[PDB]
Amino acid sequence: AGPWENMAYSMDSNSINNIDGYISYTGWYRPYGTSQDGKTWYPTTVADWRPILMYVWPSKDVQVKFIQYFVNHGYENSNYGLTAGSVKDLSENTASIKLNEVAQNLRYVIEQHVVAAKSTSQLANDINNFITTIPELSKASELSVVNSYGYKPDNSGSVDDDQVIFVNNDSKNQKIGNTSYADSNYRLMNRTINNQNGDNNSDDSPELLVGNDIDNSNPVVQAENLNWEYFLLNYGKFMNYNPNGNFDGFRIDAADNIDADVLDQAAQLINSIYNTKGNQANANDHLIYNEGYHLGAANMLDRKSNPELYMDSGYFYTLENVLGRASDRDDINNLITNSIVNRQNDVSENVATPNWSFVTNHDQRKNLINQIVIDDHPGVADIMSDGYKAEYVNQAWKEFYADQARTDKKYTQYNLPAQYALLLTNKDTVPQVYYGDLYDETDQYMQNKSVYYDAITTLMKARKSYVSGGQSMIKINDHLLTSVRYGKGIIDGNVSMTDILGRNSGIAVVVGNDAQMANQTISINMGKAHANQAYKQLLGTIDSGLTSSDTTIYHTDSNGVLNVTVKGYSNPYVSGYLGVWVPLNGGANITTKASEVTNQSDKTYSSNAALDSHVIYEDFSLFQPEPTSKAEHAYNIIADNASLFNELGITDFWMAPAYTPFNTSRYNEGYSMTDRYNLGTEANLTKYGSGEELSNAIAALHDAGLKVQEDLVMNQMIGFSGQEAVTVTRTDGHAKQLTVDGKTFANQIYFAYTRGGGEGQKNYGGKYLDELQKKYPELFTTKAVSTGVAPDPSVHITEWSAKYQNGTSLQNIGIGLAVKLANGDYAYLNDSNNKAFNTTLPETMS
Amino acid sequence: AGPWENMAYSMDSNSINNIDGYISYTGWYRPYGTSQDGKTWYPTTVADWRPILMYVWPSKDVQVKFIQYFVNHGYENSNYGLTAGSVKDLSENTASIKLNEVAQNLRYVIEQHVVAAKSTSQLANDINNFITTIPELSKASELSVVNSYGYKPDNSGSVDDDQVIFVNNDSKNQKIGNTSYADSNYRLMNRTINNQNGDNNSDDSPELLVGNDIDNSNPVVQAENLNWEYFLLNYGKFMNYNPNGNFDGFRIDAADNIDADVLDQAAQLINSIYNTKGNQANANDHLIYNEGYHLGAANMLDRKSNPELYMDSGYFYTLENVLGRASDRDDINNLITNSIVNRQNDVSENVATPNWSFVTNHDQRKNLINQIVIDDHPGVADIMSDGYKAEYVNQAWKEFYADQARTDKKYTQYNLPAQYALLLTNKDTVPQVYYGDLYDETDQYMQNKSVYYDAITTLMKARKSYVSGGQSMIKINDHLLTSVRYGKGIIDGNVSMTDILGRNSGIAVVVGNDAQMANQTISINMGKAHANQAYKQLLGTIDSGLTSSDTTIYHTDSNGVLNVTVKGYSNPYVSGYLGVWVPLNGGANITTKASEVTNQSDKTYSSNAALDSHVIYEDFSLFQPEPTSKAEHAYNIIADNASLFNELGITDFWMAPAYTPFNTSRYNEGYSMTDRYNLGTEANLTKYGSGEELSNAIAALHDAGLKVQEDLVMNQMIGFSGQEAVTVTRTDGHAKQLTVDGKTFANQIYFAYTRGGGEGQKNYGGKYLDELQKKYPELFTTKAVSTGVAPDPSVHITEWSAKYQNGTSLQNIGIGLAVKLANGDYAYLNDSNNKAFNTTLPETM
Ligand SMILES: [Ca+2]
Ligand SMILES: [Ca+2]
Ligand SMILES: [Ca+2]
Ligand SMILES: [Ca+2]
Ligand SMILES: [Ca+2]
Ligand SMILES: [Ca+2]
Ligand SMILES: [Ca+2]
Ligand SMILES: [Ca+2]
Ligand SMILES: [Ca+2]
Ligand SMILES: [Ca+2]
Ligand SMILES: [Ca+2]
Numbered sequence A: 001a002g003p004w005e006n007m008a009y010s011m012d013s014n015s016i017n018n019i020d021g022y023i024s025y026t027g028w029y030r031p032y033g034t035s036q037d038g039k040t041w042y043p044t045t046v047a048d049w050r051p052i053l054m055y056v057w058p059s060k061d062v063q064v065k066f067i068q069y070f071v072n073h074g075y076e077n078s079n080y081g082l083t084a085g086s087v088k089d090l091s092e093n094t095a096s097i098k099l100n101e102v103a104q105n106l107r108y109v110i111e112q113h114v115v116a117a118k119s120t121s122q123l124a125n126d127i128n129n130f131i132t133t134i135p136e137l138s139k140a141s142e143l144s145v146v147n148s149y150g151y152k153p154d155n156s157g158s159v160d161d162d163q164v165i166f167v168n169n170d171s172k173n174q175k176i177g178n179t180s181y182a183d184s185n186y187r188l189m190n191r192t193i194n195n196q197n198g199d200n201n202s203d204d205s206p207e208l209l210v211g212n213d214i215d216n217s218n219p220v221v222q223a224e225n226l227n228w229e230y231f232l233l234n235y236g237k238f239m240n241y242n243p244n245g246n247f248d249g250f251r252i253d254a255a256d257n258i259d260a261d262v263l264d265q266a267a268q269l270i271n272s273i274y275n276t277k278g279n280q281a282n283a284n285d286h287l288i289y290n291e292g293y294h295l296g297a298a299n300m301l302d303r304k305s306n307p308e309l310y311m312d313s314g315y316f317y318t319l320e321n322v323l324g325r326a327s328d329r330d331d332i333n334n335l336i337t338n339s340i341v342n343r344q345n346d347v348s349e350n351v352a353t354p355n356w357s358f359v360t361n362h363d364q365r366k367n368l369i370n371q372i373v374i375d376d377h378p379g380v381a382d383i384m385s386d387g388y389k390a391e392y393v394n395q396a397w398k399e400f401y402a403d404q405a406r407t408d409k410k411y412t413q414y415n416l417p418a419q420y421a422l423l424l425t426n427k428d429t430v431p432q433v434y435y436g437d438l439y440d441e442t443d444q445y446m447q448n449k450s451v452y453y454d455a456i457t458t459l460m461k462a463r464k465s466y467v468s469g470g471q472s473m474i475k476i477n478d479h480l481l482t483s484v485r486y487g488k489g490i491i492d493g494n495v496s497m498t499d500i501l502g503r504n505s506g507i508a509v510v511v512g513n514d515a516q517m518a519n520q521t522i523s524i525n526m527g528k529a530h531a532n533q534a535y536k537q538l539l540g541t542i543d544s545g546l547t548s549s550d551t552t553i554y555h556t557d558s559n560g561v562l563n564v565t566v567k568g569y570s571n572p573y574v575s576g577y578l579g580v581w582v583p584l585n586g587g588a589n590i591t592t593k594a595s596e597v598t599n600q601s602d603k604t605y606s607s608n609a610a611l612d613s614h615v616i617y618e619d620f621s622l623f624q625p626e627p628t629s630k631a632e633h634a635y636n637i638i639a640d641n642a643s644l645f646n647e648l649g650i651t652d653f654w655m656a657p658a659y660t661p662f663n664t665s666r667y668n669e670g671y672s673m674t675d676r677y678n679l680g681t682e683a684n685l686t687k688y689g690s691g692e693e694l695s696n697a698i699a700a701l702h703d704a705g706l707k708v709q710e711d712l713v714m715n716q717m718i719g720f721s722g723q724e725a726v727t728v729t730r731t732d733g734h735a736k737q738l739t740v741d742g743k744t745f746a747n748q749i750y751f752a753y754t755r756g757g758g759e760g761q762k763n764y765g766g767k768y769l770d771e772l773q774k775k776y777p778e779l780f781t782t783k784a785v786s787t788g789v790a791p792d793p794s795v796h797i798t799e800w801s802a803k804y805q806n807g808t809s810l811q812n813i814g815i816g817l818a819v820k821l822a823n824g825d826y827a828y829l830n831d832s833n834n835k836a837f838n839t840t841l842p843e844t845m846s
Numbered sequence B: 001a002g003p004w005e006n007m008a009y010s011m012d013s014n015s016i017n018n019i020d021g022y023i024s025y026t027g028w029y030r031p032y033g034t035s036q037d038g039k040t041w042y043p044t045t046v047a048d049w050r051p052i053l054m055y056v057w058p059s060k061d062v063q064v065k066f067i068q069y070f071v072n073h074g075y076e077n078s079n080y081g082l083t084a085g086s087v088k089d090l091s092e093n094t095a096s097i098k099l100n101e102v103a104q105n106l107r108y109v110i111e112q113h114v115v116a117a118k119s120t121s122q123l124a125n126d127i128n129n130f131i132t133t134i135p136e137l138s139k140a141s142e143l144s145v146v147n148s149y150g151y152k153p154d155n156s157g158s159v160d161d162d163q164v165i166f167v168n169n170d171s172k173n174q175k176i177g178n179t180s181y182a183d184s185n186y187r188l189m190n191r192t193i194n195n196q197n198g199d200n201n202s203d204d205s206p207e208l209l210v211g212n213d214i215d216n217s218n219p220v221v222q223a224e225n226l227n228w229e230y231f232l233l234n235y236g237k238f239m240n241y242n243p244n245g246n247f248d249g250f251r252i253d254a255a256d257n258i259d260a261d262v263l264d265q266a267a268q269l270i271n272s273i274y275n276t277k278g279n280q281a282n283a284n285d286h287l288i289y290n291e292g293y294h295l296g297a298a299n300m301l302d303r304k305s306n307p308e309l310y311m312d313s314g315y316f317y318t319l320e321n322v323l324g325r326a327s328d329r330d331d332i333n334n335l336i337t338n339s340i341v342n343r344q345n346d347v348s349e350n351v352a353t354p355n356w357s358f359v360t361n362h363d364q365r366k367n368l369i370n371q372i373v374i375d376d377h378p379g380v381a382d383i384m385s386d387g388y389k390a391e392y393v394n395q396a397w398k399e400f401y402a403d404q405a406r407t408d409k410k411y412t413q414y415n416l417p418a419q420y421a422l423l424l425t426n427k428d429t430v431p432q433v434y435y436g437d438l439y440d441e442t443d444q445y446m447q448n449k450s451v452y453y454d455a456i457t458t459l460m461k462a463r464k465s466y467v468s469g470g471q472s473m474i475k476i477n478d479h480l481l482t483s484v485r486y487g488k489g490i491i492d493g494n495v496s497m498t499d500i501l502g503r504n505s506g507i508a509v510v511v512g513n514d515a516q517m518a519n520q521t522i523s524i525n526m527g528k529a530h531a532n533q534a535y536k537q538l539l540g541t542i543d544s545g546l547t548s549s550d551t552t553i554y555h556t557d558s559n560g561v562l563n564v565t566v567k568g569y570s571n572p573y574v575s576g577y578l579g580v581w582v583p584l585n586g587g588a589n590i591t592t593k594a595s596e597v598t599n600q601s602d603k604t605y606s607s608n609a610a611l612d613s614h615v616i617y618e619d620f621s622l623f624q625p626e627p628t629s630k631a632e633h634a635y636n637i638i639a640d641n642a643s644l645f646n647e648l649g650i651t652d653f654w655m656a657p658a659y660t661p662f663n664t665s666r667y668n669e670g671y672s673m674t675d676r677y678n679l680g681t682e683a684n685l686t687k688y689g690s691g692e693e694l695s696n697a698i699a700a701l702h703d704a705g706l707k708v709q710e711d712l713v714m715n716q717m718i719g720f721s722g723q724e725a726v727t728v729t730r731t732d733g734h735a736k737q738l739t740v741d742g743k744t745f746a747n748q749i750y751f752a753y754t755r756g757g758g759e760g761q762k763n764y765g766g767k768y769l770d771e772l773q774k775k776y777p778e779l780f781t782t783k784a785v786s787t788g789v790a791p792d793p794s795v796h797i798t799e800w801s802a803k804y805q806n807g808t809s810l811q812n813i814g815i816g817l818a819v820k821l822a823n824g825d826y827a828y829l830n831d832s833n834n835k836a837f838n839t840t841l842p843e844t845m
Helices: A060-071 A096-117 A121-132 A219-232 A261-274 A296-303 A313-324 A362-375 A390-405 A416-423 A453-466 A634-640 A642-647 A691-703 A758-764 A769-775 B060-071 B096-116 B121-133 B219-233 B261-274 B296-303 B313-324 B362-376 B390-405 B416-423 B453-466 B634-640 B642-647 B691-703 B758-764 B769-775
Strands: A163-166 A212-214 A249-253 A288-290 A355-358 A430-434 A471-477 A480-485 A507-512 A520-525 A534-542 A545-547 A561-566 A569-571 A574-583 A616-618 A652-655 A673-675 A707-713 A722-731 A748-755 A805-809 B163-166 B212-214 B249-252 B288-290 B355-358 B430-434 B471-477 B480-485 B507-512 B520-525 B534-542 B545-547 B553-555 B561-566 B569-571 B574-583 B616-618 B652-655 B673-675 B707-712 B722-731 B748-755 B805-809
Touching (some): A060 A096, A060 A121, A096 A121, A163 A748, A219 A261, A219 A769, A249 A261, A261 A288, A313 A355, A362 A390, A416 A507, A416 A574, A453 A534, A471 A520, A480 A520, A545 A574, A561 A574, A634 A642, A634 A691, A642 A691, A673 A758, A748 A805, B060 B096, B096 B121, B219 B261, B219 B769, B249 B261, B261 B288, B313 B355, B313 B416, B416 B453, B416 B507, B416 B574, B453 B574, B471 B520, B507 B520, B507 B561, B534 B569, B553 B561, B561 B574, B634 B642, B642 B691, B722 B805
Parallel strands (some): A249 A707, A355 A430, A430 A616, A616 A652, B249 B288, B355 B430, B430 B616, B616 B652, B652 B707
Antiparallel strands (some): A163 A722, A163 A805, A212 A805, A480 A507, A507 A574, A520 A561, A534 A545, A534 A574, A569 A574, A722 A748, B163 B722, B212 B805, B471 B480, B480 B507, B507 B574, B520 B561, B534 B545, B569 B574
């Protein structure tokens, strides 16, 4: 009958793509009919949908660009007045009447193309491409700082300041819109570390990192975290896999970036289940160690009587600045002082902050490799984002291994054996060894021992026999120190009486960071307990590198003093000097059990010989490849190697984030995850294997006497498949509004991917809360610090959604996708579920 | 008779150099006797002094290096066992008794040298040089971040993180020491901007910049600032110079970096003398505009009913980002939205934050020059500090002038005329013009006009005749806007009825930033008050540059619409487009006097046509040369040119900081000052001239109808000559303790230069406080925000000292100079002035 058939077949979701009642220019809809000429109109079936952009545009300008793009991409018909020449002079200043005329004729030429191919598929590509040319309909309008003037890439590989926060919006003003289903009374952001009570922001630790940031201030979320944690502490049991395949504790990821209440609550759950507060015997069996690069966390943990191990990142920087650099190395004395533990004369217990320390972790390998890529692509701003490429990393790796075998290294660490020698002999710490320093981490899992394997395992194994007792570190000259442990039960170097175990243990580590250091003879006080004793050299420096096979027998005088002679070397392994001496009669195990030290009734963790006896092993690398068979699954190899890890004195196996990875994430490593409860199936493996294989790995490790921790990731999820209309504001990592190249936006409706969770969340979300409330009522009557209320188990989270999220890093969708009428009213589809406004549609559809 | 004569001739200041009782390894003392051979000793005269470093050292290792350094610099005698081979094997592990034996023989050899020549002059240089090799006795021990791993230089030219703060130290522990004369109960640092009350650090604005930071939280200092301000407000009268040579108000330097009590009290003073609060007629005659690069100051000043003008630094960034960049210019639209004032349809009065705005100031020119220097010397960390050289700056200037003349500019601003076109036509601001944009600022003052003189002054003069009424800005395309003023007394574009002054004023500025923009015709709404009216093009673009002599007569239709045709151009002056139209029958002055607009009884400054009638002129460049004659003094030239400034419509003459410069400061410009009250004498000229010459410049400017502001500089002084023993901690510019390459220090005695002030401070410090206290008692009963205490005029500051200071930027002296005994007790000289400890000297002394 007429062109009114452009109107939607119905004014509801059955005919009009929408998201919570809002329309998107990228949406499609089913009109009543279509037409290849103005004269004949065919009604649409239920399978005939058309892009909204054929009918509506955000401005007359975009409408002109729509015409101009399609005409120049094959949709011209001089009979209808459409050709490159006929449309080149159209602009926003053309009368509205004419432009619509032209637009109405273009649809005809489109339907012509649709009919010839019997398909909208080519048209779909042309719409998608064209959208890419319009900033407000594509990602550019999100104002990534990557495109800002003078932006430099960050070798972390992510973009701290590309964020939007989810804000409440219950407006009755249709120009502002209404997303009340996504409203929240919580979203208390930056309640991080000492700002848990919002009254001390001295750590300045940001809430937003990457992905969908989880609102860990919401009591229903806080309840779900406990459900999740409880699931993982019983993983094998609750999954009917190996009944001994359960995690014992947690590596807490991004503990500087979540509401700190959830640290209290994870440590409360483990105390409720296992009785850890005031009982180091039990607490040492359920380690919780927090990832952090903020020194203030050590204040907080000491304040809370140490519910979690603090990460001694200051010492990592010390290690790299003093020993790792090529030149301009820092004062050798800083190794004595620049850590959470001053180790000049560490001759006490229960005084240091319980802490874990490292030479490398998976993030520090990431930063260095990314740096290599950045160096090979100067002036390319998107090299770590939209212009990131795997092949660049492959090339940086070939550079990394080649640089690693050099003496004058360009990118890799100098003095890595000395670094580990100090780590594995320091008192008052739980040291952590990195998988990628033992194995070449891009090859299949544990298939290539690195150049540093022999030296580190030599030190790891020696720690079991020699590292106990007091500690003393002495600066010998400007580039040379000794660090001495006195042996089991020996408090200090003036102790004369000891038992057999102490007598035959203790250790001297000698470290220099001047490759030109003059030959010279030094005196090492080993302690009165070690007078007239035979020592051998566990590990020494030779021109080509390192030896563990010096057959000399060294002797202490009647004062426990050992004289050795040391000089500077320069080789792939040592830039300076490295030398380690242990008692000749030694070898017996000297680890301390919790029942041999005095329990501290007012601490969870307490820094002493028992806790010191522990060794954490980071079991993965982000650059670990995908396996090509069942036998290359990390879980399976880990099961078969449980005894090797125990031989090395590892007691605490930090296992990779096991969760189902978003399949387009950069490393497939598990932090970018779609499902917190699905740790792999036969049909859908993770990089590491299947959940059943995980439960066997954990069981094998327990059988070798080790405890296992899971990377608990409360900060964010990535890869949700469902969109919600959310009101957002462009912010920085700290959730403060951000202006980019003079532009910003606030309180705008955004079609973010926010709803999902997988079958894992559907079937296990909230499943144990009733059981937890029965067994542990305290978890749901203890008021959280930041909120003043207890975790709320009366709601189960079976599917995530924006009401449970603080915001998201930019998703590359664009900010002007929501359709707005000429007067600025949002278009809207009213029905039973969506009652924010009356139905309000563009004229062409209405 | 023997080595006991090494002891000091007396255990007091008469024979031992010291600072407040503390001894320095760099000091000298008079021993009782000296000897060349260990056998004969000659007693010393009053003139026979020896360096302490010949007798005492901070460690055995430095004693070793002292021996080794002097033997290898010509103090060798094999008869005395001193030769290069005889000393190379010494080390801190040599027995102390032997090293002291060796050191005693070295003195004999030193004394041999001292007798051969008849002088300790060569020994002085050897000592001085030697100290340069010991980190703990020289500047490296200060932990300058310039030397840190990975340091990059800052084109500001200073080092924000090289600071120490002065802390209280009244200890009876001789290992901690005692500097209680330097104690204070104030030193409330970072009470800056919105953190005046200590409860809102959201601006995060640091206390420490450079030099000796003045503790503007101290009530005695606050009272002295009032004394100073009152002196400057009466400069010519109180100096018996020209009786009309007095400043009228202030540009306030580093307003973001001083306790904000001090902004209140300068506004209070102006109000007490001149009755400015609630009276814009008086207030506009006594402008106080605040230097600021922090947006948070706009809120503070709005909260305080605008006692000072806010500095619209946001808009300056917008100007450089949208128009001045070579490429990737920001959205033209930002010129409408990105300033303290949104100018889409600015059709109101008394709403906007009273503000001053600029295209350039002397600090932005400096950052750019330094950046040229840094580009010219990549990878050199000290290039802006110890490695700074004027010759590099000379080279940068040859580059600046050459690049300025290019079309493809590498360093200088694109579209500078259009920037000033927008600045000088914007409503709701007091615009500020930069001296260095009208003149080639490295030449003698005003001797050389720049390439931009004709254009800026054309717009400047035009403002007198055309710029008034409401404002509308309209984005025409992605790279092109019009900004329009409707003329005197015309509120908006819909007003139809107006007097003759309105009919013949108003102005259209058309600004494009796309040099390849297509030729196109545009419509400009001039307002219903401007229908059927002839227009002339005041300033336009031509292929080679700018015209202001287009003879074309343009006409508006019956709605006030002006149709012009514009395109993109590319030449040294325009990258994009610039075009300016005004009514043909215009020319009459249209500035507004305070009495024509409604006074705001609850504001000091209010943003309306009278405030908008003012124009600030920054009179100086840091790179101004030294004059070579009397005729070349900036003051003398300013007096001869007062009519020029008023012809340009300048009403507010921002005068350079007139204080006596520290004679080795970088620009000699007056911010690095030794004397706050001495603005130049005939025998000791500042760069700009003599105080008497300044008074005649001010009077000439007044004679031309201008008001004159002095750059008021309360943040810091530099160049004190008196040292004090002060207890310091290494900090960043926010007074937070800092670690550098893993090192820090805290509560350490430092021999800082902190005492001075000049005769100006002696003869005028506190001089008017009795007068002020009787005239304006409120100044000394109003309690300051930060301290809850009124300024205290019962102590006069006639000499500055560390008790009146927050701290200092690193003075490049060293931190381990104070002499420490083996047990860590500080050495000390007890006399009638210094009673912190018993006298306690090294054993040799
Ligand atoms: Ca977070
Ligand atoms: Ca992390
Ligand atoms: Ca229990
Ligand atoms: Ca994949
Ligand atoms: Ca991104
Ligand atoms: Ca360095
Ligand atoms: Ca600064
Ligand atoms: Ca200050
Ligand atoms: Ca300044
Ligand atoms: Ca010149
Ligand atoms: Ca010139």
